[PDB]
Design a protein around this ligand. Structure first.
Ligand SMILES: Nc1ncnc2c1ncn2[C@@H]1O[C@H](COP(=O)(O)OP(=O)(O)O)[C@@H](O)[C@H]1O
Ligand SMILES: Nc1ncnc2c1ncn2[C@@H]1O[C@H](COP(=O)(O)OP(=O)(O)O)[C@@H](O)[C@H]1O
Ligand code: BEF
Ligand code: BEF
Lengths: 85, 452, 98, 92, 99, 93, 84, 102, 89, 452
DNA sequence: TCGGATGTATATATCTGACACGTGCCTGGAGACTAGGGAGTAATCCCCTTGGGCGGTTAAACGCGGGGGACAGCGCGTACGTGCGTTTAAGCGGTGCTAGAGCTGTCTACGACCAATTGAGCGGCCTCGGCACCGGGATTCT
DNA sequence: AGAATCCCGGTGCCGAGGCCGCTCAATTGGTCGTAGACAGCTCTAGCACCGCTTAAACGCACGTACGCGCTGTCCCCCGCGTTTAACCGCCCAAGGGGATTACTCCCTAGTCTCCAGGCACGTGTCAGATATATACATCCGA
């Protein structure tokens, strides 16, 4: 009866955006089952990085995940990022 | 119309000294008439020139309508929309050659802001007229930056509430309407009250609702509290403490472990004090609207609305309802539509031409769509509803001047029946905190009125 | 009607997206996603607006790197189409979870 | 002349499996594992104290070194046990 | 000292190691206690699994093969010891798509 | 016996053992020749050459068992030098 | 005419050894071009490690490569070696 | 009062490098040639990357280095691509690579 | 930051090329990353030998361990030239 | 044979007191022709019980031959080889039942060591006899450990040079031949010379080459130096300074950047002083052997050998050549074979039965294979060459007693023609350093002889 | 093989908002003495890596069937690419409101330094049984 | 058939476990600067809802070309047996080399005193962006 009914935020990563990412990766054809596989392998990456970032935040006794918490979490897992301090 | 003849006497004067002015005429007094009157006064004395009018979407329509009914023949054209605006741009009239066919340019704040480039090319505009001055009350608003690119040799500002929040909105306007007395140094007003009245007598021109016409019947703004019911108290404590997302999560049909909406507890407590269904329907993420359709009676403020309305159908005089959000108006509509009442509604989600015809139908006296839902900023500015007679403000806050502009919507020249206003509220609650804040803001407003 | 043959509009897209540097996901759904993910470890959190930017730009450089080697697995298997098998092979001989 | 963790691992093993013994190669493997873990946790604690501006390594950043270095279900137990000891150390 | 804490590892030697390696300027009092508890915990969880793998092979003394098997079965330890090679430690038996 | 049956005997036999699969003396000779181009007149401890062989054999066994996932992915049973290159391409070497 | 004719040490790694390594990897059939490919990736890996293990030794003024230099050289490359 | 950099003939701040070496207490004592050596190495690497980036900018017929040019220079060269093997330069992009029909 | 010094080096190799505000941020990050890699390798080198001093031999070994071959070969010569000019001159 | 009758008088005595002895009889006489005499003295009546003989591969053959020629019928059998040794083990005779057919067990040091298990089972051995005592001069040698597992109720040791290096070899032997002399405390000898002669008179039994019978005319050991030629000097300096691997690397046909063989120089400068080709052959592959065949004359020591040999063909008496390595003997063979001389050669690489027949042919007087290459340890122990008359030691070192055992090979009962010895060497060189070291070792040896 | 639909590639401009000095101090440089010891450069005993050998004995190398697996070709049909006409929804402006990050001021507790103990651990004595380690026969196998 | 294998009696022997005399480590008690935690004040961003544009997402229809299966050929890899030569080897030998301890110096600590840098903030001057225009180049279908 009326109301709104929201949508899984992971569904907010739309099919066109995944196709754009694959095109930048060099891909020519996509199977129709790639999208639900990519949606699942993005969530794991984000869970790992965010779990480290929030630990760094709570150590500082802060309530705001900042931009080094993320850069430190990334450098710790082999992923060095330039351009954010 | 005498006042309006003193309204055209003072804008012909402003035209003379080469000055710019803030027509702060009382809201609900016919400011618009006067505007087209000044615009005919000049239209035919060699004042042909690029002429530009900017206003809110809702009013643009009313203005065209008024032109079609007061002035016999003023070449005019509504430049609304995008891409379809490109054709009428030239089927308007010559590019810059201004003749007796050069049509009055009527635009909106979005259009004006988004594509000023198009109109930037036009000649020094004889008179740019901005309907709602409150739009420019911030000195860093992007509209103001884009509004300076226009080459304007004269400016004009229409409003009914010049200051609402504080004095800095007066400061930002001045610099705009009149760069001459800008004083970008915090201003020197801060005895002094008289000194301010020396600067402001020259331009500001305000009237009043009492004026002279006994035609205007008086209105009554009265606050009728309600008693927060048990269930709302349970919801409120489970928030004052915590674990509401979980006690209610006991159900949580959707969005399991629904995000603790523990932000600005105040707000998440105002939403409760409006109707608990708001906080319920997200945690549970269910699809069906109130199951019993009567639990709506669990909301105390809802029950006081219902009884008020049954007593106001005893006479049938048409009502007006206002709200801050649109989820709550939706609940209301659901409730009444189940009983069977015919309702009309114009929020910001509805389209422009769609909402214009709804009024044209609501304005139809024969039709029995008495109820009229209407959100504040949605359509609380620029709409005549002489048909209605009573305004109910379910909830409004943070700026008292927001509410007034709505009350007048119903109460405006031509409203014969005396108007009431029912500011509902809940006693001993977060609502009273806001009410007191509003009173504080008014306190400032009345110190401003003493200034007047 | 004038149509293009299958796989010619895909090759001009590869050239288009391999010259630009822009950020290829919508910004609001990504923020809602990361807030939903972080809503487990700690509740009632705040995100400095430059941190979600760092996250988005760290997350797309990862997917672009994964796609350009799930596309080496497809060519090894005599194809031009990528299926989930290629992603799983690539992630398993990288050790991403093995 | 050469100090190791042989005694303590042997005592722990007798506490876990009262009858199993352990050879020398496995004993070396276990000694190396403990040294590796100690170095990991200590270096992370030092670096994490250096991110903030503090010259002191307390216990509450042995917490977060553990939460960064150990995975999932392993850390949630280890952390708990750590707190246990410290309480029994001070309210003694 | 480290009898008041119910540990089996040396808190004093741990503190000597921490202050020798110059990881910081000052070392608190709960730091060697915490670090010595979380080491005996990990030793106790590896040794139990190794002993279980010893019991299946009808053996009474653990060998490197048993540590290898215990580490490669469990998910958490294999994730922690993901790049370690246990000397003289064979491999986890497995065969793919054939007899 | 038929082609392919005493091979699986070998997969089973060698995955149970723990002993070294390269002969010791040729490996020692190799590691000595490929250090003559960094430092002349160099000697090795006997445990330094046992540690190099343990790491090298582990490396090669670990590379062979994902070289075998690539061959199966391409629907084969025979490993070819094309598979080693795919495996090293993605691991980063 | 009747003298010592030597061979590239690279060959001392014989075909049966490579087949034993592949069998422990799970491989069932092996092409005949594998041996010269394995024999070339092994040398690359091994001379990456010896180059660092000898640098760690030159710093200490030693002339003997110890089993600890090799462990440090292996740890520098992401692979840890327990038990020496 | 001649600075240490002029004595060493460098452009990087030998004294500021020495302070950065002290702070953080990497150890107890720091020699007198350590910061000079470290500053000389840092200047060398900087000049290497900047030269390649300037060439890449001229190749694109520009006169101002942007992140794209740093990305191009780093990922074309061999030793620099080995060193910066797993780093993400932001607002750069991957170099052109089409393989086979794909 | 090192920006001043970075700019100087640019005006030595390309006297007519400038730099964007973001590219200088990249260069700053790169210098700060390399310095910390080298200073930590030197710390380990000193601790493995039980010495309490980081001389200019720890820096040389850290450069040989950290920088790739041809790059390290030239970095070493630059640094030794600088130290010779420092002590002699 | 009188001495040999006093040799059997003293081992019948040893058998009596229940003692063990070291037959250090002079090398080049008796021994073998004395051992089988004692073994018939007991094989008569006393039988053999389980009787075991261990010896070097080369001698095992000579021993069988001698048995076949001196003793009429001694059940005997050579247990040589592996797997083929399993059949003869039983086609030997009953397992443990010792009868008049139980055959004498003759084994080698490898066989004895590798499969002692088989012989471990046999009864307390009546007499284990070890031909070359020098094999056991180390007290940690694995043969000694495996030799104790045998249940031996009597022991015997044959040798001709009891001590060569120092006194500790005397110490290790004693404990073995006679554990009554455990004395595992560095020994108490360290006036004392007489005190040592009290312990050693009871067992050790030494005779001399002069003895009584003229038989072998006195030999002459003479050192004839040679002058290092220019090219060798060039090689030596580039070795002493450096860059030899590169100056010679100027060619380096194979093994580019050949490994600097800068192993203390000692391991190389001697190789130069032997023949420079050894170095050249490795730095540059040079598949072809010095094609000029007169580049061998660049070696000074080679040229002194050649002239000596031309003057010794003037008489034709057969020569003997010894060396330390086998690459150098190979060069020599190449050189002479080009001229056409027929050569026979027995190094360690050649097989056993193969080398036994070569001797049986060399021993053939009619055949004109006069030259005989022979490496020291290769076949410098246990071989009769009464046919030859002159021994040339190209090079030998580190242990002087190694050389003597070779000289006697030619000089042994039955050698009618007087023997010379030509220890070649290079003057003012690394060789003289070794020569002096050897003299030092002999000095010790002569202090030992004074002891005698 | 032409002729056409567009697609990128060169050339006109404006237009920002960024790049480009300028300044003015304050915190970090450099300079000069003094102290302690941390290297530096010796002298000695040794355990220890470095040549020959030399056997020798499984393992390596070579060769020969012969099948079973790789690879090419061919057919079918299904799922994905291209283009077009709606529908959201992100993506912008405007409107508010504390919350929480940052710095400073103040005292109590906590950790480094140092003397005098003493019982922990480490290197080196012995001693026995749980690893192996061998034949020798019942059972699967393809 | 002719081939594969576990379990159960028979085998040693040397490495794991105990003992130990000990001496240098870690404990108790003291002293004391300076870090902690707190407390408070300031006020700068996260965020939170609503209203418009327009660009992007979404659905849909066709059509085709790429994936997948089936069949045939041939070649190369595997299993087995014989013969050669090499690693795991017994011995030989010298110089090496590697962790030891020695007075001796000079070379890093500090405590301080001021000139010097740098970083922040306040201004212009663009130059590479972007949009309109114009050719010059390429897929495509017949
Ligand atoms: N001078 C007038 N002549 C005729 N009708 C008038 C006049 N002034 C006001 N009205 C009536 O009263 C209504 C309200 O006045 P209006 O101009 O709409 O007010 P506002 O000032 O709020 O725009 C008009 O729409 C019209 O119907
Ligand atoms: N008693 C003897 N009777 C006969 N010939 C003898 C006798 N003693 C020695 N010979 C001869 O002299 C040779 C050398 O003696 P042999 O026993 O071989 O010496 P060795 O003591 O070195 O073994 C014998 O082979 C034999 O030909
Ligand atoms: F135009 Be009015 F203010 F309604
Ligand atoms: F047998 Be003898 F010593 F030649």
């Amino acid at each position: 009866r009326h109301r709104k009914v929201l949508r899984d935020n992971i569904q907010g990563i739309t099919k066109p955006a995944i196709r754009r990412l694959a095109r930048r990766g060099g891909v020519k054809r996509i199977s129709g089952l790639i999208y639900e596989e990519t949606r699942g392998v993005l969530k794991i990456f984000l869970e790992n990085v965010i779990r480290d970032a929030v630990t760094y935040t709570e150590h500082a006794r802060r309530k705001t995940v900042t931009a080094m918490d993320v850069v430190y979490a990334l450098k710790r897992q082999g992923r060095t990022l330039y351009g954010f301090g | 119309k005498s006042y309006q003849l003193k309204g055209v006497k003072w804008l012909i004067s402003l035209w003379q000294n080469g000055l710019n002015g803030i027509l702060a005429d009382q809201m609900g007094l016919g400011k618009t008439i006067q505007t087209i009157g000044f615009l005919s006064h000049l239209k035919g004395n060699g004042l042909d020139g690029p002429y530009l009018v900017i206003a809110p979407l809702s009013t643009l329509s009313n203005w065209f309508n008024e032109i079609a009914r007061f002035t016999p023949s003023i070449n005019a054209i509504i430049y609304h929309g995008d891409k379809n605006q490109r054709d009428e741009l030239r089927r308007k009239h010559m590019p810059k050659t201004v003749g007796p066919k050069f049509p009055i340019v009527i635009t909106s704040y979005e259009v004006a802001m988004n594509d000023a480039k198009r109109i930037l090319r036009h000649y020094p505009w004889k008179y740019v007229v901005i309907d709602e001055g409150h739009r420019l009350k911030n000195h860093k608003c992007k509209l103001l930056r884009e509004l300076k690119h226009l080459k304007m040799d004269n400016k004009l500002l229409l409003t009914g509430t010049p200051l609402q929040n504080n004095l800095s909105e007066l400061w930002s306007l001045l610099n705009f309407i009149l760069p001459d007395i800008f004083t970008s140094h915090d201003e020197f007003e801060s005895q002094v009250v008289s000194k301010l009245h020396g600067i402001l007598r020259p331009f500001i021109l305000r009237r009043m609702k009492c004026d002279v016409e006994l035609s205007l019947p008086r209105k009554k703004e009265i606050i009728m509290y309600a008693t927060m019911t048990d269930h709302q108290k349970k919801f409120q404590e489970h928030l004052v403490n915590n674990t509401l997302e979980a006690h209610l999560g006991e159900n949580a049909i959707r969005g399991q472990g629904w995000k603790g909406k523990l932000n600005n507890l105040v707000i998440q407590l105002r939403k409760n004090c409006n109707h608990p269904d708001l906080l319920q329907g997200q945690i549970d993420g269910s699809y069906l609207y109130p199951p019993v359709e009567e639990i709506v009676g669990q909301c105390g403020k809802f029950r006081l609305l219902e009884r008020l309305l049954v007593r106001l159908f005893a006479n049938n005089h048409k009502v007006l309802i206002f709200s801050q959000w649109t989820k709550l108006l939706d609940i209301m509509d659901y409730y009444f539509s189940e009983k069977g009442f015919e309702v009309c509604r114009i929020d910001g989600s509805v389209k422009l031409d769609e909402r214009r015809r709804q009024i044209k139908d609501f304005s139809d006296e024969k039709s029995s769509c008495s109820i009229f839902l209407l959100s504040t900023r949605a359509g609380g500015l620029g709409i005549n509803l002489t048909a209605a007679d009573t305004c109910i403000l379910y909830d409004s806050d943070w700026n008292p001047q927001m509410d007034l502009q709505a009350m007048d919507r119903c109460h405006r020249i031509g409203q014969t029946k005396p108007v009431h206003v029912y500011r509902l509220s809940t006693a001993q609650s977060i609502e009273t905190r806001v009410l007191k804040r509003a009173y504080s803001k008014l306190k400032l407003e009345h110190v401003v009125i003493g200034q007047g | 009607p004038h149509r293009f043959r299958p796989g010619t509009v895909a090759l001009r897209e590869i050239r288009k997206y391999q010259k630009s540097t822009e950020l290829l996901i919508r910004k609001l759904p990504f923020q809602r996603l990361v807030r939903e993910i972080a809503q487990d470890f700690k509740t009632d959190l705040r995100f400095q607006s430059s941190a979600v930017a760092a996250l988005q730009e760290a997350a797309e450089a990862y997917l672009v790197g994964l796609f350009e080697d799930t596309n080496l697995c497809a060519i090894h298997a005599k194809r031009v189409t990528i299926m989930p098998k290629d992603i799983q092979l690539a992630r398993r001989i990288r050790g991403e979870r093995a | 002349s050469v100090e190791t963790y042989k005694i303590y691992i042997f005592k722990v093993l007798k506490q876990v499996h009262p009858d199993i013994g352990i050879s020398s190669k496995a004993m070396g493997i276990m000694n190396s594992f403990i040294n590796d873990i100690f170095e990991k946790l200590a270096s992370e604690s030092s670096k994490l104290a250096r991110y903030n501006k503090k010259p002191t390594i307390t216990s509450r950043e042995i917490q977060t070194a553990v939460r960064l270095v150990l995975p999932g279900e392993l850390a949630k137990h280890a952390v708990s046990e750590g707190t246990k000891a410290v309480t029994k150390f001070t309210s003694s | 000292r480290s009898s008041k804490a119910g540990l089996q590892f040396p808190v004093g030697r741990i503190a000597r190691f921490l202050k020798a390696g110059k990881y910081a300027e000052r070392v608190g009092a709960g730091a060697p206690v915490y670090l010595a508890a979380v080491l005996e915990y990990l030793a106790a969880e590896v040794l139990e699994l190794a002993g279980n793998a010893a019991r299946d092979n009808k053996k009474t003394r653990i060998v490197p093969r048993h540590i290898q098997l215990a580490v490669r079965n469990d998910e958490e330890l294999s994730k922690l010891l993901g790049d370690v090679t246990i000397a003289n430690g064979g491999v986890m038996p497995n065969i793919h798509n054939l007899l």
